Design a protein around this ligand. Structure first.
Ligand code: W49
Length: 284
């Protein structure tokens, strides 16, 4: 579609400014690989970036959706949302996503690493930052669908940036199940498991699970509940139990995130207000 080609031009980065270090692999996933990259500005200043390949994107429909997603995400400008520097649509090679490099990697690996010692307050602070980034994304009507601690990055100042190192995004929820690479079952809202649909309210459910990952320092949720038994576990009214070091008011926030009625779950704006009040009770 020629109009889509013209609209996406401002998102495109090419060999005139980007060098992909294809032998410097940062990470490998089902979507493809993540490589170190260097972007040069007009004064020759170097910008360290991460370059994610989206191997699934090959046919004209997928490529059009990729261009649409790049236009949408190029507009992102919020301290707790990972910016999209640009995209590369090479004549030869799979499409590439150009992101700012994140010095401290993903939030899950960070809190799980035994050499790190984040306090309960630092963990609540990371949750508050994620809630702010999700309040921004929700205001843009952007439904994440894969919010989890593994998908939130930490920059050189320990600022949390909501990001996505999962499968290439789909425009429609009906394409999501087909495209999956396991579904993030243990982060999904009850209605997404049953009806295959995703909304900002199902992102709120995932945020509650992400808060649980933070308070357990990256423990796998429902380790003892098989993926195929999660839907029934949630129907029996059962939930993730309160982590040992999770304050009661923050566990109450998690319970509201997992309300069986999506319309009754708090909004991200309410979560920012509530978690800010809880965070303010911790000294340090
Ligand atoms: C089709 C398709 C795509 N699938 N994913 C894409 C991306 C991508 C974006 N971002 C950041 C801008 C982000 C994402 C979601 C929420 C907050 C911040 C990532 O972190 N990873 C990505 O792969 C960029 C893009 F131009 C196209 C696609």
């Amino acid at each position: 579609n020629p109009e889509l080609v013209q609209a996406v031009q401002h998102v495109v980065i090419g060999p005139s400014s980007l060098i992909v270090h294809f032998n410097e692999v940062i990470g490998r996933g089902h979507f493809g690989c993540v490589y170190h990259g260097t972007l040069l500005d007009n004064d020759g200043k170097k910008i360290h970036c991460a370059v994610k390949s989206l191997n699934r994107i090959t046919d004209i429909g997928e490529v059009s959706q990729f261009l649409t997603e790049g236009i949408i995400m190029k507009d992102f400008s919020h301290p707790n949302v990972l910016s999209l520097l640009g995209i590369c649509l090479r004549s030869e090679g799979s499409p590439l996503v150009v992101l700012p490099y994140m010095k401290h990697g993903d939030l899950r690996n960070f809190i799980r690493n035994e050499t790190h010692n984040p306090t309960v307050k630092d963990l609540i602070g990371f949750g508050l930052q994620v809630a702010k980034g999700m309040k921004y994304l929700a205001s843009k009507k952007f439904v994440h669908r894969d919010l989890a601690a593994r998908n939130c990055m930490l920059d050189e100042k320990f600022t949390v940036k909501v990001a996505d190192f999962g499968l290439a995004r789909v425009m429609y929820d009906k394409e999501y199940y087909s495209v999956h690479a396991k579904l993030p079952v243990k982060w999904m809202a009850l209605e997404s498991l049953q009806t295959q649909k995703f909304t900002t309210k199902s992102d709120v459910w995932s945020f509650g699970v992400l808060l649980w990952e933070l308070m357990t320092r990256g423990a796998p949720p429902y380790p003892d509940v098989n993926t195929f038994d999660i839907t029934v576990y949630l129907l029996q009214g059962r939930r993730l139990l309160q982590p040992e070091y999770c304050p009661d008011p923050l566990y109450e926030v998690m319970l509201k995130c997992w309300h069986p009625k999506a319309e009754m779950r708090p909004s991200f704006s309410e979560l920012v207000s509530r978690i800010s009040a809880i965070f303010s009770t911790f000294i340090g």
